[PDB]
Every structure is written in structure tokens, then in C-alpha cells.
Design a protein around this ligand. Structure first.
Ligand SMILES: COc1ccc(S(=O)(=O)NCCCCC(=O)O)c2ccccc12
Length: 136
């Protein structure tokens, strides 16, 4: 197999900035103690691609997570904050668009390459948080 456009996400990334994540988590419904501890985390994210399967791992002092998925194909995800959600991730104009659905609610997480950074934009009900990762 040769290159894929998604290979631009592949690598080891470290969180360097976070804006409005507490308010985003509030909107998602995250409880106090989880918000405080999760908010402190400075995770590393490892993204790899193997055939049609994309894997996103996150390692931090808060929680270690891993999701593997095929674009456009819904999967079960247990989030860092312990929600059990139905997730679908697609590629739209170079941007990984990740929708999580649970308990009649929905949130969208966009991951995109900007310069040498990987920018993560999380949106829930008018509230947006921006998290920026750099190469590790
Ligand atoms: C470190 O704490 C978290 C990580 C990921 C998630 S998530 O379910 O994967 N949605 C956010 C995804 C992008 C954030 C990031 O990877 O830096 C959390 C969701 C709610 C509260 C805390 C979360």
C-alpha cells in the first residue's frame, strides 16, 4: 500500500495549549471532579494508519484511551470521561470529523493539520474548545 492523505495525521503528538475546555466539558455534562482532573491532563496522542484502519491513542495521567476505526463506519467508544457513545469519523476536505452521540446528545470533534500543528476543535451546543498539539 502507498500513501494516503490521512498520513498527515500520523505520528506522536503532545498537547501544548487548551482553550475553553472546561466550559466545553460542562456543556457535555462532565461532573466536577472529572472536569478538574481531566482539565489538568496534558496528553500525548499517537495516530497510526494500517490499511483502512485508523488508530488514535491518547496517553495521559488522567486516562489512557485507544480507538480504531474505518472512515464512515460507526463504532462504540468509551470516552476518557466514561461516556458510552456511538462514534462516526469521516474525512471532509482534509479534516477528520468525529461525531459522538449518546443519551440523545451529540458533540463534534474536528482534528486538522495546521502548519506543523494538529488542531482539535470540540463543539457542543454553541460552546467550542480549541486544543493544540505539536510533534513530540
Ligand atoms: C483529557 O480529557 C478528555 C479527553 C478526551 C475526551 S473525548 O471524549 O475524546 N472528546 C475530546 C476529544 C479531543 C480532545 C483531545 O484529544 O485533546 C474528553 C471528553 C470529555 C472530557 C474530557 C475528555
Amino acid at each position: 500500500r502507498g500513501s494516503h492523505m490521512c498520513d498527515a495525521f500520523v505520528g506522536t503528538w503532545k498537547l501544548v495549549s487548551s482553550e475553553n475546555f472546561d466550559d466545553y466539558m460542562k456543556e457535555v455534562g462532565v461532573g466536577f471532579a472529572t472536569r478538574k482532573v481531566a482539565g489538568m491532563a496534558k496528553p500525548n496522542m499517537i495516530i497510526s494508519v494500517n490499511g483502512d484502519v485508523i488508530t488514535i491513542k491518547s496517553e495521559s495521567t488522567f486516562k489512557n484511551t485507544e480507538i480504531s476505526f474505518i472512515l464512515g463506519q460507526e463504532f462504540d467508544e468509551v470516552t476518557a470521561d466514561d461516556r458510552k457513545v456511538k462514534s462516526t469519523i469521516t474525512l471532509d476536505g482534509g479534516v477528520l470529523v468525529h461525531v459522538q452521540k449518546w443519551d440523545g446528545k451529540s458533540t463534534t470533534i474536528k482534528r486538522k493539520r495546521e502548519d506543523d500543528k494538529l488542531v482539535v476543535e470540540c463543539v457542543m451546543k454553541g460552546v467550542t474548545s480549541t486544543r493544540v498539539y505539536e510533534r513530540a
